[PDB]
C-alpha cells in the first residue's frame, strides 16, 4: 500500500553476458539492491524459458536467489539477488591462487549449493569461478542457471548428452562418450575450480588425449604446475577428484569425507 515501492532506479551495469547485459537496481523507496539480468531475445528462447523455471525450483543460501521475471516485450528480465562481492574469479591471483583457508570456505560452501542442486534433481554444468559469485559478506553464490537441466525426475536418473559447459572445466566423459552421468560432471568442474583457487592457473586447455599438461595428470607427474604449488592435502583431494573414469570418481558424500575438506584452518570473520 506503500506509493512507490515497485520502483527501481537502474543505478549501473554490472556487466555484459551473451544474451546482453546486468545492470543494478535499486528500490527507490527501501534502497534495497537487486540485479537484473537483461536477455535480448531478438539475439534465444529455448535458453530463458528454462533458466527461469530452474530458477523458481531454487532457494539455497548458496545459490543465487531469483525474485521473479517479466516479458515487457521482446526483453525477458530475471531480477535476482545482487551478490556485491563480483566473481570468485576476481578473488583468484594469477599464478598465486589465494589463501588455503579462503579457498577450502569457499569449497564448503560450493558444495553446498552444489548438494542441494543435485539433492533436487538439476545439474547447473558449468560451474567455473565466473558463475560463482560473493555476497557482501563473502558467501558463495551459484549463478546462472542457464545451461542447467534436470538429470533427476520422478526418482529415476536420465543420463545426459548434450555437450556443454566450458572446455577447461568440462570433464572427459562429455568430451569421449555419447551418455554420461550428470552428477560427476559437475563434480570435476568443482576440482578445477579447487585446482584454481590454489594455483591461480588451469591445468588443461581441456582433458583430451591430446592435450599434453592433461596426459602429465594422468602420468602422475605433480613436480609440475599446477600442482606443485599445491599442499598434499588438498593435491590428494584432487587426486580423487580428477579421475578420467566417471565412474570411478570420488562423491559429493566421499569428499566430504576427505582429510583435507575436514583440515581446521580457518578462525570467524574479522571479529564474528
Ligand atoms: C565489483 O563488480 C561487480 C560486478 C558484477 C557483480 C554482480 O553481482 C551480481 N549479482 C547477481 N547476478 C550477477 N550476475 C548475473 C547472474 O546471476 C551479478 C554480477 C555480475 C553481472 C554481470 C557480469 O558479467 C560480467 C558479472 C557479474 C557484482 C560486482
Known amino acids: 500500500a506503500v506509493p512507490f515501492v515497485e520502483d ?15 545492470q543494478l537496481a535499486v528500490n527507490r523507496v527501501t534502497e534495497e539492491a537487486v540485479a537484473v539480468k537483461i536477455v535480448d531475445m531478438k539475439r534465444c528462447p529455448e ?18 536467489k531469483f525474485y521473479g521475471h517479466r516479458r515487457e516485450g521482446n526483453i525477458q528480465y530475471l531480477f535476482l539477488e545482487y551478490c556485491s562481492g563480483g566473481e570468485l574469479f576476481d578473488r583468484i591471483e594469477p599464478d598465486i591462487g589465494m589463501p588455503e583457508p579462503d579457498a577450502q570456505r569457499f569449497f564448503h560452501q560450493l558444495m553446498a549449493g552444489v548438494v542441494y542442486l543435485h539433492g533436487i534433481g538439476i545439474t547447473h554444468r558449468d560451474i567455473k569461478p565466473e558463475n560463482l559469485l560473493l555476497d557482501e559478506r563473502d ?25 556443454c559447459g566450458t572446455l577447461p572445466y568440462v570433464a572427459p ?10 552428477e560427476p560432471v559437475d563434480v570435476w568442474s568443482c576440482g578445477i575450480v579447487l585446482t584454481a583457487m590454489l594455483a591461480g592457473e588451469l591445468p588443461w586447455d581441456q582433458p583430451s588425449d591430446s592435450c599434453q599438461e592433461y596426459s602429465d595428470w594422468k602420468e ?7 600442482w606443485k604449488k599445491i599442499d598434499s592435502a588438498p593435491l590428494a583431494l584432487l587426486h580423487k577428484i580428477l579421475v578420467e573414469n566417471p565412474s570411478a570418481r570420488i562423491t559429493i558424500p566421499d569428499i566430504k569425507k576427505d582429510r583435507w575438506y575436514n583440515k581446521p584452518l580457518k578462525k570467524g570473520a574479522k571479529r564474528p
Open 8 to 22: 527501481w532506479d537502474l543505478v549501473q551495469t554490472l556487466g555484459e553476458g551473451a544474451y546482453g547485459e546486468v
Open 47 to 64: 535458453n530463458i524459458k528454462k533458466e527461469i523455471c530452474i530458477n523458481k525450483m531454487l532457494n539455497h543460501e548458496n545459490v543465487v
Open 139 to 163: 558467501n558463495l553464490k551459484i549463478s546462472d542457471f542457464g545451461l542447467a537441466t534436470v538429470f533427476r525426475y520422478n526418482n529415476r536418473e536420465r543420463l545426459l548428452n548434450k555437450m
Open 173 to 182: 566423459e562429455l568430451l569421449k562418450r555419447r551418455e554420461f552421468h550428470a
Open 220 to 226: 602422475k607427474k605433480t613436480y609440475l604446475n599446477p
